[PDB]
Amino acid sequence: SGFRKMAFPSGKVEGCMVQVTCGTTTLNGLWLDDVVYCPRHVICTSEDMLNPNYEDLLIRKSNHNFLVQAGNVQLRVIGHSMQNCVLKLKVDTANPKTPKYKFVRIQPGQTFSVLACYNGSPSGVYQCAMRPNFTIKGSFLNGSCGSVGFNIDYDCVSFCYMHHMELPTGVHAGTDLEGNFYGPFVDRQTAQAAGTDTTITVNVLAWLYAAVINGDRWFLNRFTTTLNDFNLVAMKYNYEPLTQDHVDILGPLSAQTGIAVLDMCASLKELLQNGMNGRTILGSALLEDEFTPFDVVRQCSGVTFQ
Amino acid sequence: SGFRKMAFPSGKVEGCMVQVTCGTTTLNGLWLDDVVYCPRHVICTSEDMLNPNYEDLLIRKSNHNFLVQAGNVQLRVIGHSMQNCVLKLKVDTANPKTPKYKFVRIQPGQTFSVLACYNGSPSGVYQCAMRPNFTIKGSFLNGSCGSVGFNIDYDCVSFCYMHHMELPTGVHAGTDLEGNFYGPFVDRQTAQAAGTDTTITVNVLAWLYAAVINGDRWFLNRFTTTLNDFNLVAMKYNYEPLTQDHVDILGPLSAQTGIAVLDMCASLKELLQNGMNGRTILGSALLEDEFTPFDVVRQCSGVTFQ
Ligand SMILES: *[C@H](O)[C@@H](C[C@@H]1CCNC1=O)NC(=O)[C@H](CC(C)C)NC(=O)OCc1cccc(F)c1
Numbered sequence: 299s300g301f302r303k304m305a306f307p308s309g310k311v312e313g314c315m316v317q318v319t320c321g322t323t324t325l326n327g328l329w330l331d332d333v334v335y336c337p338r339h340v341i342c343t344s345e346d347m348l349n350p351n352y353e354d355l356l357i358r359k360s361n362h363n364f365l366v367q368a369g370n371v372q373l374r375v376i377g378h379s380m381q382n383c384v385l386k387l388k389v390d391t392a393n394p395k396t397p398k399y400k401f402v403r404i405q406p407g408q409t410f411s412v413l414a415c416y417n418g419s420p421s422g423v424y425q426c427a428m429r430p431n432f433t434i435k436g437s438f439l440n441g442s443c444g445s446v447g448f449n450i451d452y453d454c455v456s457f458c459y460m461h462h463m464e465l466p467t468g469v470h471a472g473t474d475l476e477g478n479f480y481g482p483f484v485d486r487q488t489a490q491a492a493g494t495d496t497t498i499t500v501n502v503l504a505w506l507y508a509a510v511i512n513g514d515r516w517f518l519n520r521f522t523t524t525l526n527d528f529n530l531v532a533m534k535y536n537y538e539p540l541t542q543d544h545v546d547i548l549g550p551l552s553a554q555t556g557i558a559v560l561d562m563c564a565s566l567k568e569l570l571q572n573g574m575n576g577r578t579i580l581g582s583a584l585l586e587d588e589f590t591p592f593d594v595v596r597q598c599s600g601v602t603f604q
Numbered sequence: 605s606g607f608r609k610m611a612f613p614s615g616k617v618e619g620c621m622v623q624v625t626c627g628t629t630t631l632n633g634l635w636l637d638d639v640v641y642c643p644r645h646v647i648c649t650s651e652d653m654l655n656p657n658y659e660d661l662l663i664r665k666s667n668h669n670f671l672v673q674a675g676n677v678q679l680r681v682i683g684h685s686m687q688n689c690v691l692k693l694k695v696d697t698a699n700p701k702t703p704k705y706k707f708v709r710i711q712p713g714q715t716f717s718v719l720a721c722y723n724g725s726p727s728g729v730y731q732c733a734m735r736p737n738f739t740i741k742g743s744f745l746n747g748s749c750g751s752v753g754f755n756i757d758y759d760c761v762s763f764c765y766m767h768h769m770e771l772p773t774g775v776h777a778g779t780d781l782e783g784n785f786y787g788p789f790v791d792r793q794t795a796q797a798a799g800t801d802t803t804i805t806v807n808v809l810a811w812l813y814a815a816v817i818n819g820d821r822w823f824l825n826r827f828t829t830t831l832n833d834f835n836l837v838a839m840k841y842n843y844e845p846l847t848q849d850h851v852d853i854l855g856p857l858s859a860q861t862g863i864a865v866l867d868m869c870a871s872l873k874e875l876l877q878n879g880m881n882g883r884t885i886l887g888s889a890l891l892e893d894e895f896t897p898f899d900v901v902r903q904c905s906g907v908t909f910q
């Protein structure tokens with residue numbers, strides 16, 4: 299038993315990380331087949347680049363302007379292109395460690411594993427959720443750009459994030475692997491801010507289900523509420539609305555515990571209006587919303603990824 | 605910026621995990637060079653679990669009774685010895701993916717990454733702290749025994765933990781890689797319980813320093829304290845005593861922030877007395893104690909946000 303925030307094993311991704319290093323700027327790249335993907339802002343910017351023309355900068359560059367290092371090894375770049383905010387560098391060598399992979403775009407509320415890297419060397423791994431305001435609460439320092447987020451599906455790696463920047467509130471923003479930002483952000487060093495965050499209601503409910511399963515029950519009551527009644531409580535406490543689909547995917551957990559989903563929602567008011575009243579749930583004094591319903595099921599069962 | 609519980613990249617350990625099976629019982633093993641290490645209770649019959657004489661069980665086994673599988677490959681066992689509660693199986697094949705590694709025994713308060721595995725296949729990775737009562741608060745299901753905890757320090761893998769059992773309160777216990785349990789526990793299904801846990805004070809202070817490095821100061825105060833006065837108050841909140849060694853180890857973090865350790869202790873005293881008053885520190889409404897001073901220095905930058 300037990301419930302822990304748990305990243306996917308990172309070995310399949312560690313073998314794809316490289317250092318991409320142009321001019322004075324160093325960041326990480328993702329080496330798949332004979333292409334290295336990295337954030338486009340690696341391109342030697344103006345000096346002054348109040349507003350960089352990435353299209354025009356890339357035309358001024360040759361192949362060897364880009365130094366790519368794989369472990370201690372130099373990779374020969376033979377072509378370079380851009381797709382949205384990602385720079386695609388062709389290399390002469392296919393990565394022999396390339397896993398089965400697909401590029402996917404993730405929805406807010408869904409989670410993925412982050413492999414933080416520096417100078418092309420993996421440094422750590424942790425789980426993040428795509429917030430409703432399209433930021434993630436991560437841990438990134440200078441040189442971490444190009445770190446990627448992913449999920450593993452048996453043996454298929456679904457890459458879903460590149461890392462790009464940090465917002466003034468200390469949270470983080472990035473793109474999918476096709477170079478499309480999550481959220482209303484741009485890759486310029488200008489005034490940017492995250493919208494007011496909301497709480498992922500369906501994940502909170504899943505986490506409460508995980509709590510009852512592991513023995514925590516003080517917050518339950520015999521009351522219920524209709525879907526409409528709850529949503530007005532959520533809208534006051536800055537929570538995502540709860541849809542009939544959300545209730546549906548929570549079905550399995552309702553069976554395991556014998557609480558109807560709306561019958562759990564009655565608890566959630568209680569937590570929202572009154573609070574936890576000096577108590578804790580799964581070792582937290584807050585309501586946690588970065589465990590998806592599947593994350594909970596992936597945890598009560600043992601799903602491995604050979 | 606940002607602060608997260610961050611595991612080490614698990615790739616170096618993923619390549620060492622295998623499946624070991626004796627009769628009807630299956631668990632994970634650690635394959636390094638031509639030896640596979642796994643918990644000795646894999647030999648146990650069902651028939652008895654309370655008082656097995658493992659020496660007697662093992663003498664009755666031959667090499668081919670042990671089935672070792674690395675992915676799709678069966679490994680042939682050519683020798684077997686027992687060291688405390690760990691079984692060492694010699695194999696005819698050295699693991700070619702074997703890293704630089706060391707076996708270490710960690711002290712309470714130390715942290716490590718756990719690679720949860722099932723049927724020899726990695727399932728997830730997460731950070732754990734050796735609690736003062738010699739348990740870890742993990743996530744383990746049936747079949748997870750043989751999963752290991754580790755740290756990586758310059759491509760050297762320090763193995764410090766092998767999982768054996770779950771205690772009645774939902775926490776977990778295991779051994780070092782030499783087979784000696786952490787704590788007064790034994791690998792039989794008898795009446796066992798963890799001692800009362802305490803809070804790892806030096807880790808809490810490290811985490812408070814981490815908060816300051818990341819720009820947060822609301823919890824500081826204008827006071828200082830003597831080491832003894834702090835410990836007399838802390839023990840009243842069920843906190844581990846703080847030793848001069850702990851104060852010395854906090855030196856670097858105190859230098860980076862310009863907060864004296866005893867001034868940070870003054871803050872913690874006030875936090876224990878007051879609570880969070882609806883506030884959070886690094887996104888938690890509780891005082892977190894599973895980040896060591898080293899964990900903080902590894903993750904934060906060396907430039908604080910003054
Ligand atoms: C073995 O893989 C692992 C499984 C435990 C029990 C469930 N979650 C775990 O981490 N350890 C054991 O099965 C040990 C083996 C002993 C002989 C050392 N047995 C055990 O922990 O029994 C207690 C127990 C508690 C909860 C649930 C359960 F199935 C067993």
Ligand SMILES: *[C@H](O)[C@H](C[C@@H]1CCNC1=O)NC(=O)[C@H](CC(C)C)NC(=O)OCc1cccc(F)c1
Nearest residue numbers: 339438439440441442443462463464485486487605
């Ligand atoms: C890439 O390596 C870097 C990662 C950032 C840096 C510090 N934490 C991160 O996540 N990205 C950038 O530096 C980014 C590049 C521009 C072209 C988009 N700019 C940026 O993040 O500026 C905001 C910032 C805030 C605090 C500290 C900092 F260095 C930068």
